[PDB]
Write a structure and sequence with these properties.
The complex is a heterodimer of chains A (about 150) and B (about 130).
Chain A: H1 5-15, H2 20-34, H3 51-55, H4 58-75, H5 81-84, H6 86-95, H7 101-118, H8 124-141
Chain B: H1 2-11, H2 17-30, H3 48-64, H4 71-74, H5 76-85, H6 90-107, H7 114-131
Classes of the chains: A mainly alpha (about 150), B mainly alpha (about 130).
The structure holds protoporphyrin IX containing FE (2 copies).
One protoporphyrin IX containing FE binds near residues 38 and 141 of chain A.
């Protein structure tokens, strides 16, 4: 996907206003609560038996931070997401067997959480650019499956 | 169960036509292909047409929350319109549902808990399934 200079600058500025710890925990927690089959991949994280248990799980939060850190790498390489995410794509396909549809779901939960976090600042225009970002990341991660 | 999705819908302002209008605006901007279903609409930002349509969508969903026991019956005419007459590709319902969640979360994050998020996602998917059926 191609972001213009202005689209890139806008997603950069907005990400900087974000509490990454909160957004990471919120995103991965909501993935597990809203799409409960994704819990199968995270058995080792412990108690996921209720929404409150999921959102209060420290391993979910710490993992969410690692996922956000990967999005950060992506934002610095929007012209080469496939190369950037090649090892992670291999991990999710060949080791973890995550169906690539779930990459799209996580991206869209991130968009819902950015909206939740940022309110009016997350404008319809801001969202358009962020949809390009999360689509690009999902596509890059799905590449080893191809 | 049917009271709680109903409760959640009101608490995040699902009744509000303005939020329906914002969800449409978000959809049109993020997913430009969806505009091809509305060639008769002025797309100018403060569009009277988008405002009125936002109210239609909000009102229809708000009515539907009172009829969770029988959505196919409640949405019969709307299903005919979307599935038989307009032939809306099912991907588009997922785009609008997502933009509605984005909108509701935007304005009322305190009420848009993970549990409410899950319930409303299921509700909007259920409505989508009915509207995509013949
Ligand atoms: C945009 C989408 C995603 C990104 C950027 C992403 C990123 C990451 C990263 C950075 C790691 C850490 C690897 C390491 O620390 O060496 C990881 C691990 C992992 N990911 Fe993802 N991920 C995504 C989507 C998903 C989805 C949708 C699932 C499952 C539904 C998933 C399941 C896992 C699992 C099970 C691990 C290993 C966790 C552990 O045992 O510590 N990922 N991912
Ligand atoms: C849960 C999802 C949706 C609901 C509740 C909904 C609701 C409605 C309502 C209440 C109307 C007016 C019906 C009437 O006047 O008799 C309508 C019309 C229409 N809908 Fe939807 N809709 C949904 C999804 C979609 C999607 C995803 C699309 C296309 C991207 C779409 C395209 C249209 C079009 C083109 C019309 C005709 C409006 C006009 O000509 O002004 N709808 N919808």
């Amino acid at each position: 996907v191609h972001l213009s200079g202005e689209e890139k600058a806008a997603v950069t500025a907005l990400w900087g206003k974000v509490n990454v710890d909160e957004v990471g925990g919120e995103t991965l927690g909501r993935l597990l609560v809203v799409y409960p089959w994704t819990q199968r991949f995270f058995e080792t994280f412990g108690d996921l038996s209720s929404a409150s248990a999921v959102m209060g799980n420290a391993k979910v939060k710490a993992h969410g931070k690692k996922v956000m850190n990967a999005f950060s790498e992506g934002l610095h390489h929007l012209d080469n997401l496939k190369g950037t995410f090649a090892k992670l794509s291999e991990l999710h396909c060949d080791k973890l067997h995550v169906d690539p549809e779930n990459f799209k779901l996580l991206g869209n939960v991130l968009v819902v959480v950015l909206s939740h976090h940022l309110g009016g600042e997350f404008t319809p225009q801001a969202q358009a650019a962020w949809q390009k970002v999360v689509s690009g990341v999902a596509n890059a991660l799905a590449h080893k499956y191809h | 169960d049917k009271a709680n999705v109903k409760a959640a819908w009101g608490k995040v302002g699902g009744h509000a036509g303005e939020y329906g209008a914002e969800a449409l605006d978000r959809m049109f901007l993020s997913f430009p292909t969806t505009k091809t279903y509305f060639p008769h609409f002025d797309m100018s930002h403060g569009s009277a047409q988008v405002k009125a349509h936002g109210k239609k969508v909000a009102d229809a969903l708000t009515q539907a929350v009172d009829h969770l026991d029988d959505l196919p019956g409640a949405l019969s005419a709307l299903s005919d319109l979307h599935a038989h007459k307009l032939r809306v590709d099912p991907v588009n319902f997922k785009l609008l549902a997502h933009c509605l969640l984005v909108t509701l979360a935007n304005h009322h994050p305190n009420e848009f808990t993970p549990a409410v998020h899950a319930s409303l996602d299921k509700f909007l998917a259920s409505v989508s399934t009915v509207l995509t059926s013949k």
